[PDB]
Structures are given as C-alpha cells and as structure tokens.
C-alpha cells in the first residue's frame, strides 16, 4: 500500500527593498521557513491507525514551488528571474509558469511508529528543521509609470509524507494535483518608483523687467531649460492652456498676460506648442523657450503683467 498525506506551513512574512531607480535592479531574500505545518490532505489505502511493529518504508522531503510569471497593480507581467538555486535540485524544465525544486534529506527509513497514520486536516505539529537558504534577484521591466505599488506574492511552502510496505519504492507525486490546491502562504512587497526621466530645474522661473514701448513692440526675451535622462526612448510633452487670449490668432499659442496682451510663445523659433524627439543613447540636451513680446494690436494699453502657463512631460 501507499498512503501519503501532506503538510503545509502557516507562515506569513515581511520584507522591503526601498526605493530603486529603473536603471538599477534589486535583489531579494527567499528565506527557508522551519515553521508550523498544517495537514491539507487526507488519503488512506492501507492501515488506518499507526502501529509500527514491522519495519516499513518511510521518507521525508520538502516542497516549495513558485510561479514563473505574475502580475502587478496595473497588471504588468512580472518576469521572475532565477539567480541562484542554492544547494537544491530544480527539475521539470518543460514548465513555463511554475518552478519545481525538491530536497531529498530523509530517505529509506524503517518505520516503528504507533498512533494514527491517516488523520483529519485540522491538526498542527511542532517541527524544527533548518536547511540551506536561497538568495535571488529580479529582471524588472523597463517601461514603468510613477507612483507607489503594492506587489502581492502568490506562493506555497511545505512538502509531503510517505508510508509504503517495502524498501525501494520510488513513488512520484504529480504536479497538477499539487497546483490545484488552495493558496494560504504569505504575500508582501511595497514599492515606490523613483523614475529615470527627471529634468534639470523643475521650479520654472522666467523674468524680465522695465523698458520702453517702441522697443517692447515685437520684442523677444529668452530663457533656457534642460532635461536629463539615461534610457533611449521617444519622449513627448504638452503645453496646457492656463489663461485666455483676447484676439484670435490661430496656430500660435498666445498666453494672455492681461490688459489686452497675448504674448505669443517661441518653442525654439516656432510656435508649434509641442514636438516629438527620440533618444538613441543617454545624456541631456538644452531647450531655450522664449516668447515674442507683442501682445497688443496697436491700441496700446500696457500694464504690470504676470500671466501664466503650464508645460508638463508625457511618458511614452
């Protein structure tokens, strides 16, 4: 006969990496747990209650299995990278969404155990068995948005028992019956994105003082702004309308500075509003945004002007 019942742990853990930049990658501890197990399987074909007066077969192995691909807050596919398997034995290369490693430490033992061989799942036992630890890392994706994310980890941690009648019974347990079981063992990651595209100033101070009227008519005053990143991608931006213009001028983004003065802006020579550029390497550029100081259609009513606008950057 071959009666096999399973043991599943009751541990929930915490862990934290902190704040990592998108160009960098993290590493993480996958600690082995010698916790309290709970029975989640009740099968019996041979004897019901344990007697242990005949030297029957026994072995005890561990069982930790993890899925190869999960999801995040916005549903992104989290590619779990395997870094170092430890001193264990990873098998089943024909799978694509589950890892399969086992550890044979207790084997070919003759049994002399009394009691009950096949019991109910509502039972817990104290077992202290520490083993080899595993250390990993993760190949995270490139295109990630900003904000804070809470990554939930679905896993299992535990293994199986064995009671046969003879020495030399290499029994194997299928994986579909193992993966169809419910999930209880711990989930815990929290992360906030730093980002890889951050401009230079982010305070946007543009200033110009007093002058005459005739010089001011169709005058120009410039201001430069740079931005630096290190990932090759196609970056765009958008200029938001804050104020309102008096006259109609069409394609020209004229910002109303008050008193009948709609100063047209200069996106490095032309009033186009927004453009599109690409990055093939790392680095930075420079981008001088000025504006033409003509805002009144010759019925000149000048005053103290402090009109505003808002330009932000859109990720690809």
């Amino acid at each position: 006969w071959n009666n096999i019942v399973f043991y599943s742990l009751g541990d929930v853990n915490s862990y934290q990496g902190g704040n990592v930049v998108i160009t960098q990658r993290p590493q993480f501890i996958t600690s082995w747990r010698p916790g309290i197990a709970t029975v989640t399987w009740n099968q019996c074909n041979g004897p019901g209650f344990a007697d242990g007066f005949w030297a029957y077969y026994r072995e005890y192995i561990a069982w930790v299995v993890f899925p190869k691909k999960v999801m995040t807050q916005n549903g992104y596919p989290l590619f779990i990278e395997v870094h170092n398997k430890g001193s264990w034995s990873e098998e089943n290369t024909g799978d694509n969404d589950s890892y399969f490693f086992l550890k044979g430490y207790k084997w070919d033992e003759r049994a002399f155990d009394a009691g009950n061989l096949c019991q109910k799942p509502g039972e817990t036992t104290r077992l202290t068995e520490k083993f080899d630890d595993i250390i990993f890392k993760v190949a995270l994706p490139a295109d990630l948005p900003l904000g804070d994310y809470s990554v939930k980890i679905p896993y299992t941690s535990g293994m199986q028992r064995h009671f046969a009648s003879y020495l030399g019974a290499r029994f194997k347990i299928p994986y579909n019956v193992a993966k169809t079981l419910p999930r209880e063992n711990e989930m815990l990651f929290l992360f906030k994105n730093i980002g890889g595209c951050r401009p230079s100033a982010q305070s946007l101070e543009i200033k110009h003082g007093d002058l005459s009227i005739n010089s001011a008519n169709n005058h120009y005053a410039a201001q430069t702004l740079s931005v630096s990143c290190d990932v090759p991608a196609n970056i765009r931006f958008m200029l938001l309308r804050n104020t309102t213009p008096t006259y109609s001028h069409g394609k020209k983004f004229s910002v109303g500075l008050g008193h009948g003065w709609d100063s047209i802006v200069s996106v490095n020579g032309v009033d186009t509003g927004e453009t599109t550029m690409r990055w093939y390497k790392a680095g930075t550029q420079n981008l001088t945004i000025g504006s033409r100081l003509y805002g009144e259609s010759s019925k000149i009513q000048p005053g103290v002007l402090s009109g505003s606008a808002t330009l932000l950057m859109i990720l690809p």
């Binding site: 929930v12 862990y15 934290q16 902190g18 290369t93 250390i135 809470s150 999930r183 930075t284």
Partner: protein
Amino acid sequence: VEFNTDVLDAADKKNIDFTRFSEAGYVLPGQYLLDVIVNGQSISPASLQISFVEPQSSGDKAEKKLPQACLTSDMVRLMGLTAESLDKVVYWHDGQCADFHGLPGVDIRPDTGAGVLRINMPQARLEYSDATWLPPSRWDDGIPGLMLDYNLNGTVSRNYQGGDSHQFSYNGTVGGNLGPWRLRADYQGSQEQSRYNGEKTTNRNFTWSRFYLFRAIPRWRANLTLGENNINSDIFRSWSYTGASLESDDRMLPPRLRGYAPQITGIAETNARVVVSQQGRVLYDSMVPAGPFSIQDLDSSVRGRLDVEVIEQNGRKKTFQVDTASVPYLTRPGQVRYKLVSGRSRGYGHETEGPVFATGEASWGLSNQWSLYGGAVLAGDYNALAAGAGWDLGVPGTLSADITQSVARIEGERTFQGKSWRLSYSKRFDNADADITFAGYRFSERNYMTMEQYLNARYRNDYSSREKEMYTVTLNKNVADWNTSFNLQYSRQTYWDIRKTDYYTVSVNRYFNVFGLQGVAVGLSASRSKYLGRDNDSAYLRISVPLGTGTASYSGSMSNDRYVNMAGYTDTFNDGLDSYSLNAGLNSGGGLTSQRQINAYYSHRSPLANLSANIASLQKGYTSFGVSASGGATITGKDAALHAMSGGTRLLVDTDGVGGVPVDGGQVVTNRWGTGVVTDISSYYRNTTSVDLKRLPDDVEATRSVVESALTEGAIGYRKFSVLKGKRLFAILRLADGSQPPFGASVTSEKGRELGMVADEGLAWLSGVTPGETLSVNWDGKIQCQVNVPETAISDQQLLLPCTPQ
C-alpha cells in the same frame, strides 16, 4: 583731458580727487569683482578675486600706460589653457601685471560698469570645454570617510489562527572609500519572532552578501574591478564568480566624438567651402577635401531648416533641402570595447571557491558600418571560443551573427565539442511604423555545455535542460488615429525530447477621453501558453482615470479561473511632493472561496530620512500595520550629516551656523552643526548649486549663491560658502590739523577691498566694516591716512574719527 572742476554743488573747492578719479576711469587700479568671459562662455560665474594694479615694469619718459588685470595663478590654471604648449603665464608672478607680449591676436576689454571681462581668442591656443566634455583635471576628491544608507521596516501582524507581531527587515550598503579606491559592502539580515499561546519561537539571521571595492581610470577609459559580481547576458548567460575585471565606462567622451551623424554624399567638383546656417548663424565654415566629402564632426542639435550652401573654388553654388532627421546609427566605428575578466568561481555559499580562469571578450568596428566581436573564455578545464560580426544594410534592416566553438572536458572523462550559431535581426523606423526591434534564431545540439552547466554538471551532476532550436520576432506598429500601438506577438520554445510550451501574447493600447480630461490610458493584453493539451488564456484589465489629486484605479486579472478585482483612489497631496496610496480589492479563487483586501498607506519625505506608514488588512490575514525608515549618512568627512538614499554620488554643501537654509535639488535643509548634502546629481555634468533665495528665513541673509563644480561617481565635493554679514556706518573722518581731506577719494581695505568714498563734510558712509581693523584712505595716488575702528562699534552709528599718518 581736463574736466569741469567748477560746476559742482559743493561749498568747498577741494576737488583734487574729482578730476583724478574721472580721469582715472579708463582702467581703475583698485579691487573689484568681475566675471571673466572667454570666447562667449565663462569659466567662473562668481569670480570674486579680480585685481588691478599700476604696472611699473615698462619704463618710459612719461610713464603713461594702461593697467591690466593683475591675475593670480588659480584662475589662469582653472581656465584650461595648454600650459605645456605655450609657457607665457607659468613664469608670471602676482606682484606685476600679466603682460601679453608673447602671443598675438588677443584683446582684453575690462569694463567694471557691466561687471564682465571679455576675452576673444582663437581655438589654437587652448583646449575645449563646456557643460559636456569636462577637462581631464581632477575634481574635489578629498577625505571620503564612510557612507551608510539604511533601509529597514518594522511591522506588526496577525493570522487567522491567533496573533503574533514581531517583524523586522535589516539591509544596507556601508563601506569606506579611500581616495580613488572606493569600497562598499552590502549586508543582509532580518529579525523574526512569533508568539502563540503554546509556543514562543524566534530566529535571527545575518550574513555578508556582497563586499566590493573599485577604482576608475580616466587615461584608458576603463574601470578596474576586484571581487565578486555577475556579468550581463550578451551571448553567454549570467554567472557568479570571484576575481578581477576590466570593464567599460564611456562617460568622459563628448557626443560629437561618440555619436556620428551621416553627412551629405554629394560629389560635385573640388575642395569647396561649406556654409550651413540655422537661424542666421554659421555653425560650420571649413574647407572640405577634393571630390567626395563627409562631415561626421557635426552632431549638434537641429530643430529646423538648415540651408547647406556650398562655395566652390571657381564660385559655383547649389542649394538643396536636407532634413532635420539626420539618422545617427548605434554602431561605433574606430572605437573598441572590451572585457578582461579573470579569477575564481563563486558557488552558492559564502566561502565557495572553484577553478581558475582567464577570459577575454572584445568587439571591433571597421569604418564601413560593419562590426566584429570575439570572445575567448579560457578556464583550467573548460574552453569556449566565440567570434562573430554585425552590420546594418540600410533599407532591409540590420543583421548580426556569431559562432561559439566550445570544448568541455569533464572530470568523468567525457569530451564534448560543439560549434553553435545564433543570428539576430532587426528593422529601422519605417513609414507605417513597421518595427522589428529583435528577431533571434539560436541553433543548438544535445552535446552542449555552458560555463554554468559545466559547474553544475561537474559538482552537482545534473544532466537535464537541453535545448534544440527556435525563433522569435518583436514587431510593434502604431497608427495615427485612436493612439494605439499594436504589438501582436508570438514566441516559440522546444527542448530536447521534452515538449514545446509555445507562447501566444497580444496587445492593444487605447487612449482617449469621454466625459473627462485626456490622460486616460487603457492598455490591454491577453496571453496564451500552448501545450499539446493545455492552453492557459490569461488577460489583464484596468480602469484608470486621473484628475490630478484624484485617480480612480481598478484592476482586473484572471490567469486560470481566478478573477481578481481591485478598487482605488491613489494620488498625491496639493504640494505634489507628498503622497498616499488608498485602495480596496476583491479576490475570487478557483477553490470556492471569495477573499477581500483593504490596504492604506501614507508617506513623508523628511530631509533627515524618508519615513512612511502602511495599513494592510485582508481576509484571513489580519491588522498588518507597518512603518518604514530609510535614509543615509556620511561620517568622518568634513562633518557628519544625515540625508535621503543615494545611488552613487553626493555633493557636500557647507553653510556653517545656519540650521534652516533651504537649498534646491531635493530641498534638503541643514543642521545645528551647519552642514548639508544633496543627493540627486549625476556624473560629469554642470551642477549649479543655488539656494532657495526667496525661501530664506528672516534671521539669515545671502550675499551670493551660485557656485559651480562637476562631480563624478563616488566622490564628495566640498563647497565653501563665503556668506557673512556687513555692518554699515557713517564715519566723520577728521585730519590732524583739523581740516577736511578732499572728498571723492576711495577707501581700500587691508586685504585689497574697495568699499566706497568720503562725502562733503569729511564724512564717509561705509558698509561691510569689520570692527577692530585699521583702515586705509587713498588720494593723490598713494596711501595718506589710517584710522583704527574699535571693536565696540555696531551697525548704523555716527562716529567722529581722527586721522593718523602711516
């Protein structure tokens, strides 16, 4: 220069310094602050030391000459002149005026009315520098000390079966740099303890995960490396080892020398003269060679029309329209790249050793846009030879391929030999956005053994995971309506005598707005893993609409019969820098159970260290409340400090005495000792450290703010701040006879500092006076008198002062 001495509102006719200062106004031999500008740019935005003295070198009959800038040696050595080529300033002292008798064509116009110093000179006498392409002079790398940065989390918990709450994370990367040699060792630890009714167990763990030291070289543009690390997957996979490594660093080179744009291949007749203008400014005017020419020296920023005007030798001209897209390639001809790594292999344990190797990996590009790459990994019992080329054909895309001849002689006497070929293919930016960014094809056999496979089969003896042959492609295409970048995909695998598990993944990204603002991004994906009998159809769903301080978030996901739901309102605060995450969720599992979770969070970016809090509570897992501590510190430098998490570079702003000054960059405030440190900076850039001038408190003031320096990775830059207060007072200077001296005479200090001048009734309002010194008044071309200001004087007082001669 002669002026009118009579026309002035003064009751006293003593104007000997009134004609003199007016006449002396060509070059004034005094001490002011000027900004030295060389050929348009500036070497110093806040140059304080600018000295002027009358030259008595050149003797004459009249001795009426022009004084120049009496420069010292620091500002002439920080400007970047090639001092070994032309030695005309290395022999000049600070006592006399630096004369320019040895070199031609450079003129100097010192104007103290504009606060500038213009120098116009040719490029053949000096080197080149800007915000990009810093000179090879060493920067501020002094007293590195130690660098700590902790990231720890303390939290509570409770399960369905009772409760237990003691959970602690323990990580950080400490290490001490010593000059150019810089060290960092990252520790790994934790603290767990559980308290049930019948059992009280706990465990503690700590280990030295990774300890490492490094030093960079600017002469050969390579970074040396000693210790344990991993190599990225170019051809071979990733693997652990211990030892030496010579790797890449291409931060120093300029983008004109790095990138090269394709030029005009027009061949008209001879050695012509090109003229290219953008807005009415010639960016390039030189003599091209005879016949065919190609200018790859110009890779600047263009955003428009550029009229390529050619001036031939006979006088012929031709105008044609060139685009703004000048299509720069990723291949780099003339530059090589290399990996010279050696040492021992690292297993899984901390003291796990192995065999000794010697590996050489290099790549070389020829200048016909073709590029080869060869690798020679050589160990004591395992050898693999790699070679291969890559080239862009232009209009059909680009290709690259390589062969890897590997021999493997294991300890169990089994020699395996194989030559495997892998080819990579891609595609340029097409018209209808046809973009194959990668297309691989890896040919293998059952007789293979990689280095990781050699180390696992040699000691752990596993004889599995054999791959036969496969193909992949990566196509992505957008359309100019509905904002959708279609990326339909297919990837296929197969092992040796193990099944396929062929994949099928598709995608569609909608972007629009109905009854709301634009910014709603809807990206949708669906995946399928095809086995012989099983096809797992997974798909992700979401609803995300932002409104700035509010964002309704939802998340749907179903791998295999397990649909999960989420609901949230996560966004920032009104300042935009503070944040909180708030979301609920619904979980439906396949095993007849419906689960629910509710998680709350709030963060706070304090300048000493970043802190946050979290609330997590789900079904069967209860009351997991947390708190986090993360930040950084630097001890045994100039002064100890506390900051928020670094990734390799930090600059040290020194504002002594003031505890509350806000600086820019990351808005860090200082301490009671008066020291500060910024974090968000990068290597080899123009770093303008200015304080928040309008956010100053009313106890302190600021004289000047802009200081300039360029830092590298792992160095700490010290920045001294000369901001001090100045007392202002009205002093009535009286002579020895009783009479008043002729007003209009300027007062110089003891350290060479001009402050102001004497008014009509022998009075002199002066600001910035230090109490205790002995001042100097100057008229008729020399020093005339001295007065001794007492230490009991404070600002805004009326003091009668007696004159004593020197």
